[PDB]
Amino acid sequence: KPSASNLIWSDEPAVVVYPQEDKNSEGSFGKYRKPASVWEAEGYPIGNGRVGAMIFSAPGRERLALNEISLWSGGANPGGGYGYGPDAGTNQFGNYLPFGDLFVDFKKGDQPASLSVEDFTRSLDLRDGIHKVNYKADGVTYDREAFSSTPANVLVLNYKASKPGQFSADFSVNSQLGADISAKGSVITWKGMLKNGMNYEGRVLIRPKGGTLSASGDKISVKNADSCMVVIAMETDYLMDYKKDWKGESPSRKLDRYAAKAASADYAALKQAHISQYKSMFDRVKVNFGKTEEDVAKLPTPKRLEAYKKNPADPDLEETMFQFGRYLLLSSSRPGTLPANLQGLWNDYVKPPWACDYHNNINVQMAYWGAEPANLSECHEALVNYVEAMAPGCRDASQANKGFNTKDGKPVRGWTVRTSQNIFGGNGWQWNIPGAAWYALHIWEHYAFTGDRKYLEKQAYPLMKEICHFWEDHLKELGAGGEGFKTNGKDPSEEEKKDLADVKAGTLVAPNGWSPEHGPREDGVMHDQQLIAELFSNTIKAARILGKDAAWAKSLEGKLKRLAGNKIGKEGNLQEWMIDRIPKTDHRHTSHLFAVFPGNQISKLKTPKLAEAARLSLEWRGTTGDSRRSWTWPWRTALWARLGEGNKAHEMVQGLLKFNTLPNMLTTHPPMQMDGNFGIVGGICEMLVQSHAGGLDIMPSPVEAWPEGSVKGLKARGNVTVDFSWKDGKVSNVKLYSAQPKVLPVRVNGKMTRMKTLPLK
């Protein structure tokens, strides 16, 4: 009986193909059309935040498509273009790249291993972070395991069998980048230098027990061994420091310190240390949404998802999706290394969709939506450390932009970003002028959730203040009744000016904005205003907590009160623009609901009239086929959840799974984009616990699809850990934990109580 949840698995061997089209036979793709389509749907991913693999296991062959998170082309990209590809140099944007592949060709004796196998399963077990294969052939049971170890800092593979002397295979490395590959002794080494100067090296260290080991050509063969452990180690000379030209130690010198040592350890010891580190992160949150029918829970994941599409009743599969988002984030994001990109850290493409980059118009943010509420707070440090380290490049691009110059012709203070960023301070494509303000929301929430004052004073507040200065420089002043307002460059019409009537003098608006991704270009679009008000408000809070810059903070509190704010339109919707344009639209985006989520300005508790207007706006967006994207479902999940529509929020979870999830549970835009996986964690957390509206609010509205369940380990602002259960329409067993004894207002079961915390075990 395969576990009903936290296990992704298939009874079908993976399709194994080379990422280079020309390297594959006529029908090697099975039901797919191209190697990329195979890769995104068939692979199971492992990672330790820095190195990872997408694993394609079959009885005859096995492909590990390999990644190290810093392998990037491109560079400073001073012209702001969006050119990429593996040969992109310092004057271009560049892209995340594939590191290599390990191919394993299994043999029986000296002939190919048979595919006449029995009881084949390949599985990604989320409970221990291990990819597992198991099958039977000719009375012999074979087992494979693979994981990405944080303590050992390598990928570890292990092949075993029920009888001695049964393991034979040929190991080979594939590169799409022209790497130089050579085998010697028991190690395959591959290395290269990108056109932008980045050096990289990988090593595959083969460690059989028994049998023979020979190195012919650049392949390595193992014959008639008992078992075989493999270590895969990979490094670049990337260093996240612009003052060092982004260059640190050579990759060979890094690998010399640890790879051989890891390959010399005992497999059982490597495995135990991995599982222990892994559970220390994964086990922080446990949820139960209900019990799926045993006949449905027995289905392999591809068939279970096809079944879900026709009858979406599978709370255990939804629990798996939720935990997969946590698994993917902890596997792609750690404090000392780069943040998760559009695909986490997994990529097979030399020219990936959207450069597999850092998109700050929603994607990178959504990637971190689960970091704080789902108890993976240290993962969020990777994002903030990145933002700090890329800022000198953003200041360069922002100062070079004469369009940002103040009225005195001086360059702007602070910085903002273009829509895309690489790992060298480069910015690409359209300016995303409020994007740094949105970064500042993550910078503040890391403090709101942890209470880490050192973080706030040393890292967060200096960034926030600089982003504020940019807006103190770029905001535009309006006269009474909208005097000065521009829309698409022209003055407002007489009908338009009727909306502009109540605008007091000195009103501050972001000039010439765009509500993402439709309409006109005009002053004070509500998306911009909300992002700025959130930036100013949180920076002001930070200053007073740190007792710093009191004068400028009260100065800012005045500009905050002068910003154009939210308006309820004549039809009752929340306005998306200063002008009262019709809310009936199918448009995908709901950019003026930022203030409901992920922002903090509109809540049911604190601003009921604005919330009901927001709820009408979202209702009138409807749900059409074009509103189906990897990133719409999780945002609408969180929105509906915060607006008290639990059932609507659950319908968005179902929609993600029905329409935008691949057979391996990776979300797809299309093509594959992990924002959905990452973001649905945040959306589901808001269905269970809210802490943005003045205190803890536990399951504020029911979810009929989850009549009975429980959670342990969710995080709330102020660094509180939350456990509870629910059954019928009642929440019970509410228990709050903190490090310091506190007393808190708690809304639960429709009543506002006050409870004290228990100490954090």
Residue numbers in the entry: 25 to 785
Paper lines:
We discover FucOB from the mucin-degrading bacteria Akkermansia muciniphila as an α-1,2-fucosidase able to hydrolyze Type I, Type II, Type III and Type V H antigens to obtain the afucosylated Bombay phenotype in vitro. FucOB displays α-1,2-L-fucosidase activity and showed no activity against α-1,3, α-1,4, and α-1,6 fucosylated oligosaccharides. A close inspection of the crystal structure revealed that FucOB crystallized as a monomer comprising three domains from the N- to the C-terminus: (i) a β-sandwich domain (residues 25–260), (ii) an (α/α)6 helical barrel catalytic domain (residues 357–712) and (iii) a second β-sandwich domain (residues 713–785). FucOB as well as other members of the GH95 family follow a single displacement inverting catalytic mechanism.
The high quality of the electron density maps allowed the trace of residues 25–785. The (α/α)6 helical barrel of FucOB displays a deep groove where the active site is located, mainly flanked by solvent-exposed and flexible loops, including loop 25 (α7−α8; residues 357–386), loop 28 (α9−α10; residues 429–458), loop 33 (β19–α13; residues 547–550), loop 35 (α14−α15; residues 587–614); loop 37 (α16−α17; residues 651-655), loop 39 (α18−α19; residues 683–699) and α-helix 8 (residues 387–392). A first glycerol molecule is deeply buried into a pocket defined by W378, H383, W655, and H693. The O1 and O2 atoms make hydrogen bonds with the side chains of N387 and Q697, respectively. A second glycerol molecule accommodates into an adjacent solvent exposed pocket mainly defined by Y106 and W453. The O3 and O2 atoms make hydrogen bonds with the side chains of S444 and H383, respectively. A third glycerol molecule is located near the first glycerol molecule. The O1, O2, and O3 atoms interact with the side chains of H693, R612, and H613, respectively. The crystal packing analysis of FucOB and FucOBE541A structures reveals a strong π–π stacking interaction between W453 with two prolines residues, P765 and P783, of the neighbor protomer. Consequently, this protomer restricts the entrance of the substrate into the active site, supporting the inability to obtain a complex crystal form.
